[PDB]
Design a protein around this nucleic acid. Sequence first.
RNA 1: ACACAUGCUACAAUGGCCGGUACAAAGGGCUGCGAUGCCGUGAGGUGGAGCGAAUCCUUUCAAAGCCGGUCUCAGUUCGGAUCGGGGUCUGCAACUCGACCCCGUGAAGUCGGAGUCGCUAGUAAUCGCAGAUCAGCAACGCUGCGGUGAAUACGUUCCCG
Lengths: 66, 181, 116, 78
Amino acid sequence: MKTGIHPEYVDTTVQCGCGHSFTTRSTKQSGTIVVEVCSQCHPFYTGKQKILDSGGRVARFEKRYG
Amino acid sequence: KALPRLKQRYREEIREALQQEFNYANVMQIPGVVKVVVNMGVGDAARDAKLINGAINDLALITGQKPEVRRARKSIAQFKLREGMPIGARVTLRGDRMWEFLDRLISIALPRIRDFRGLSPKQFDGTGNYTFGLNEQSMFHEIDVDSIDRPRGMDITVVTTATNDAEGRALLRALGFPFKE
Amino acid sequence: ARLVGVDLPRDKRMEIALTYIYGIGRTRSNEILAATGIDKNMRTKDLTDDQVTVLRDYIEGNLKVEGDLRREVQADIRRKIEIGCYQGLRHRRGLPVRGQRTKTNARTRKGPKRTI
Amino acid sequence: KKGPFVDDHLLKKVDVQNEKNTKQVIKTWSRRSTIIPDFIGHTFAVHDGRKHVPVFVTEAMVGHKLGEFAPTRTFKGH
RNA sequence: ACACAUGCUACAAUGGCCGGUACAAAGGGCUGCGAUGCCGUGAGGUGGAGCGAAUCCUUUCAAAGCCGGUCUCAGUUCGGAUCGGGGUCUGCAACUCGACCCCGUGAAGUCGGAGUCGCUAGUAAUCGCAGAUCAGCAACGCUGCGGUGAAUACGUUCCCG
């Protein structure tokens, strides 16, 4: 590592809304990150919703119900 | 901290389970990340002189390294190039910088991108290296969202000791990196 | 502030700050801000992250947004352009779909002008 | 949506067509309804006045009235 | 793919949006006009008071106006075209081709080159209302009704008849 050219590299404490907390080295001067994302990926859920999204014959039968 | 967190779990769990999955029969064949290099764009060289210092600054404070400015091998005429103009810088990460960058992006950068469905498993080379595209930026909470006029994108490469490709799929699957069949 | 995926401005009221998302206009702002309980007169600088939490969970739970409407509107237009409808023919040729005037006006579908 | 239009001549013909499990090209006058999903699979010779165009009916056709799977106007421009 | 012509909505603060409130004229009505009430968010649904109508219905009729709050000059709380979903009504039937309502969507457009048009007082300008045709409506049209309401005319040299 060279001395003076690299930015300061500090410990941090990352917190999400649910409180699931992370401790890392980072570049932030604040020493913390107040984030809205945790290790709760929505791809698993988003993908399911997207899969669920198609199919309209049923919807048509809906309007008529008969 | 003796071990970075991703490496805290890598030094026991992913290695023991990857031996479970693949019977190499020899310890120290088991595959691990070598370097994580980050691939600075631009292409505005010749067209605009000022921005590349925007990219030097950009690579820095996403991770704390001074990106080394990488320039043109040759002047190729159509896309205005000139031998020796700066066209994007890159930063090579290895060790504590590699792992702290990885865990942070993993638990920070990947979830935020709008409509971020996943990452393709297909994007390996012949030998177990994974590269994917960050089109805009401001996936990172390191960059203040009003400091940032135009979006500078980048490539991020994970380079492993994976002699195959499903080796690297298996590592980067067990390592907390997303994918989507 | 930050929300469902639209970067909110500096100084806007809430019934206008909600409007900058693809699924929300003025009336949905007047019904969302009545259901959740946030004052419509609140600026975006004065917005609370817990208000982002309750508001965000409400409007991703009981209403659809950016990716759902762009993929849904796109998937329905390409739905009627695959099956061979006459409105499919209008979306093919780049013509107005509602059967309206094509002789003089409907320039917003043909677009910029070439003159022969 | 009290009751959607049904094309009673085509309705009588369609029922006969699907009771016998027989599929036949149909020269049909009717431009007005694809009423039930009972019309799925039957080939309709739609009549724009001048000739009959064969149209296969699949599951996505439900809710589109029958005539304009066949267009009535022709335009090229040059 | 176009080019012309008459109109309408605009490009915002003399403005937009929410709340409260005051004032018209004329008209229209039988298999028509249809109230209170109830169901809807709203087109409307259910119901039929009462009227061939200075009486009943079109609500006691308006909108611009006034009082108040908010918006702070921005492609915006301007602008509504377009497009998606969801409806209602009329009709045997709303695909080619109806109007209206709800949710979303949110484009051009920053007062407009050469030119050119209208208008001399309740006029111009702007604001709603009714009618005929009509089951429904392409009505922003046409014919009328009223509301608020200006500037300028030195004068025949010039253009037009």
